[PDB]
Amino acid sequence: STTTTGAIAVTGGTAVTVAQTAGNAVNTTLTQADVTVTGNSSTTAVTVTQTAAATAGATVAGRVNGAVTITDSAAASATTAGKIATVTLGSFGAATIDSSALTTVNLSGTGTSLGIGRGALTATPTANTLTLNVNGLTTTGAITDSEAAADDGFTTINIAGSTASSTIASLVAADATTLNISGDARVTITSHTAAALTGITVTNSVGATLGAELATGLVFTGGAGADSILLGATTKAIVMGAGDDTVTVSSATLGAGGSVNGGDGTDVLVANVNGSSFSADPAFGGFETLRVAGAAAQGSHNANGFTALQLGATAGATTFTNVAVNVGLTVLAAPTGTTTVTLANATGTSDVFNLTLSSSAALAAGTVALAGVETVNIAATDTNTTAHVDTLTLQATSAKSIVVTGNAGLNLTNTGNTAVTSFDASAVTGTGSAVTFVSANTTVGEVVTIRGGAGADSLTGSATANDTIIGGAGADTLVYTGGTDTFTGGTGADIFDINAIGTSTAFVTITDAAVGDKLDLVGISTNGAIADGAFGAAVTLGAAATLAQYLDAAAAGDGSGTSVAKWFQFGGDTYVVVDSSAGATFVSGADAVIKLTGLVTLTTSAFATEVLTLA
């Protein structure tokens, strides 16, 4: 049903299990049953399972969870023992337990809040260890020790994560002293409120992450596996253990003394600060990667002695100084202001930098400046299965090569990068990992090579240059600007967008024009706008007519008021002409020729607007 599951109450028994399910339809919401268990003095264990909560979607069955209330016999007594030792939950709304004999809680699925009270026993309790086994648990809100506030709570909390990731939105334990996170799968505590904590100790294989910034007085010890914390001006010796760990610091220098060692493995140090020099400070050790990310992250950062660099969202413009050779930057989120990299030594002529862009969604990497680097390698990386296009302004005024790899698109702003003679995005991979590039090269008579990838790419050369442009798979747009250009749109419906007139010597050759490819002549319509028909009888001349003769023949008509297209086949190759002139001379200046390698018959092929589609 969509109408909600009515109460469930149990009283008494050696052990109790109430197992709800919800089987409602795919666009409805059923809210589940309120459960109450009240033990008699035989009740050692209680279990209350439900179906996991979800939001009513197009194909998602909606479920809200029922409150659960568990109460032991001796819950209100000042003296009587109490019998409920273990409680197991499998999803829940606003849950309560109240038992002075409680040691273990097993959590699972989707929760709202758990409030743990112990019996109102007046005697001061001696055993005060909450074992809290988690497995696939996610919480809207707080696990609280209700007893700790005004009475005698648990002094030591143990959390054993198991077979699946768990996330506790908030853990509130005001009498807690030790906190040990153990087991088998990640435990994440988004926010703890445990002022009296003297230590935290991860022993867990996958690791533990704590989203709340630790107390400056609070010791933390990691184990194997990716543990992950936030520190301020710490007073204590923080150890991170083995595996790939992550500490975020809110202040650049520590305090008292006041240290943090990353331990074995590749560990990230995150600088949420106005500048850093972590290599210098012996207080920090065992770190390999420096990441600049956070709401206070900004300014000048000493890269020295790190083997890798990362960047996330930032407060303002951030600069990496003293960057050693073979050290690459990975950008993980949109930063604020220009990101400058300045290397240890830029002076050589074979300088290589590895920039990486790595995100699940479209990433606006912003401006990164790489003065004195000759080869710039860009990886554009998508972390999920669904395709996107990243954006970057590169300022690399002495780069000769740009190579793009990866599996996401890159629209690259290239303004002012005038040394670039080789753009190679050929290795790029998705349906639409679309690469956009425009050469900023102005060296007269240069050889420039532009390579597209699997995406629907948009590659523009330079009027200055003899551009070789090659799209990969997909709907590529190759732009002609001037000079002796060689175009190859690979597989797919490519568009050869002709925006310049050229000469009789400096013109575009299109190597592989085939059925489906287009020839956009909008930009050479000097006088008016082209044919518009299916204009398709080849100009024919004699067995030994010259290219010069065929050109003159093709331009014989009057193009003064209205430009006209014609075409011919000379010496084994196919040519297209735009006549924009009076006399029967093809005039180099305003009349235009386009070469197409091979015999391609344009008989049946038709002019769209000023756009010729090969038939």
- 579: partner contacted, choices Ca ion, a copy of itself, none (Cβ within 5-8 A by kind): Ca ion
Question: Which range in 104-112, 143-151, 320-328, 500-508 contacts a copy of itself by CB under 8 A?
Answer: 320-328
**Which residues are within 8 A (CB) of 456 and not within 5 positions of it... i.e. 6 or more apart?**
432, 434, 474, 475, 476, 477, 492
DSSP state of 397: T
345 near a copy of itself (CB under 8 A): yes
Is residue 261 a contact point for a copy of itself (CB under 8 A)?
A: no
Question: Strand (E) positions, 85-164?
Answer: 86-90, 92-98, 104-106, 110-117, 129-134, 138-139, 142-145, 156-161
Taking a C-beta distance cutoff of 8 angstroms, is the pair 266, 286 a contact? no
Residue closer to a copy of itself by CB (options 23, 282) is 282
CA 187 to CA 247: how far, in whole Å? 16
> Does position 397 bind a copy of itself by CB under 8 A?
no
145 makes contact, choosing from Ca ion, a copy of itself, none, with CB < 5 to 8 Å by partner type, with none
| 352 part of the interface to a copy of itself, by CB under 8 A | no
Backbone angles phi, psi at 331, to 5 degrees: -95, 130
Determine the longest span between alpha carbons in the chain, in angstroms.
118
CB of 357 to a copy of itself, least distance (A): 26
Q: Which residues pair with 398 in a beta bridge?
A: none
The 10 Å Cβ neighbour count of residue 279 is 16
Closest C-alpha among 596, 593, 542, 584 to residue 566: 593
Phi, psi at 73, each rounded to 5°:
-45, -55
Q: Does 257 bind a copy of itself (CB under 8 A)?
A: yes
Residue from 285, 316, 348, 528 touching a copy of itself (CB under 8 A): that is 348
Contact by Cβ (8 Å): 338, 317: yes
Binding mask 227-256 for Ca ion (x = CB under 5 A): x------------xx-x-x-----------
345 binds, among Ca ion, a copy of itself, none (CB under 5 to 8 A by kind): a copy of itself
Tell me how far, at minimum, the Cβ of 17 lies from Ca ion, in Å.
26
Contact predicate 189/212, CB 8 Å: yes
Breaks in the chain (C to N over 2.5 Å), named by the residue before each, are none
Tell me if residue 550 falls in helix, strand or coil. Answer: helix
Tell me the C-alpha distance between 391 and 408, whole Å: 10
Residues 6 or more apart from 392 whose CB is under 8 A from it? 357, 365, 366, 367, 368, 378, 410, 411, 412, 413
Residue 25 touches a copy of itself, criterion: CB under 8 A: no
By CB under 5 A, residue 145 contacts Ca ion: no
324 lies in the binding site for a copy of itself (CB under 8 A): yes
Neighbours of 525 (CB within 10 A): 15
Least distance (Å) between residue 219 CB and a copy of itself: 17
- Least distance from a copy of itself to the Cβ atom of residue 354, Å: 18
Q: Determine the Cα angle at 402 with ends 396 and 408, to 5°.
A: 110
Q: 342 or 484: whose CB is closer to a copy of itself? A: 342
Secondary element (H or E) of residue 547 = helix 547-554
Q: Binding marks (x or -) toward Ca ion, 31..70, rule CB under 5 A?
A: ----------------------------------------
Contact call for residue 346 and a copy of itself (CB under 8 A):
yes
Work out which of 179, 254, 332, 428 binds a copy of itself, going by CB under 8 A.
254
How many residues make contact with a copy of itself (CB under 8 A)?
24
Task: Name 331's bridge partners.
Answer: 311, 357
d(CA 17, CA 411): 58
Nearer to Ca ion by C-beta: 258 or 523? Answer: 523
Q: How far is the CB of 66 from Ca ion (least distance, A)?
A: 24
Distance CA 108, CA 465 (A): 65
From 254-262, 376-384, 415-423, 548-556, give the range in contact with a copy of itself by CB under 8 A.
Answer: 254-262
The entry of Ca ion, a copy of itself, none that residue 390 binds, CB within 5 to 8 Å by partner kind:
none
307 binds a copy of itself (CB under 8 A): no
Asked if residue 267 binds Ca ion (CB under 5 A), the reply is yes
258 is a contact residue toward a copy of itself (CB under 8 A): yes
Residue 545 DSSP code: -
Choose among 300, 389, 302: nearest CA to 337.
300
Closest to a copy of itself by CB, 85 or 371: 371
- On the 0-12 / 13-18 / 19+ scale of CB atoms within 10 A, 150 is exposed
Q: Which does 124 bind (CB under 5 to 8 A by kind): Ca ion, a copy of itself, none?
A: none
Which of 120, 219, 352, 364 is close enough to bind Ca ion by CB under 5 A?
120
Question: In the complex, which residues of this chain contact a copy of itself (CB under 8 A)?
Answer: 253-258, 277, 279-283, 302, 304, 321-322, 324-325, 344-349
Question: In the complex, which residues of this chain contact Ca ion (CB under 5 A)?
Answer: 117, 120, 151, 175, 222, 227, 240-241, 243, 245, 262-263, 265, 267, 279, 284-286, 346, 351, 372-373, 382, 384, 386, 388, 396, 398-399, 452, 457, 461, 465, 467, 471-472, 474, 476, 481, 483, 485, 489-490, 492, 494, 497, 499, 517, 522-523, 555, 579, 581
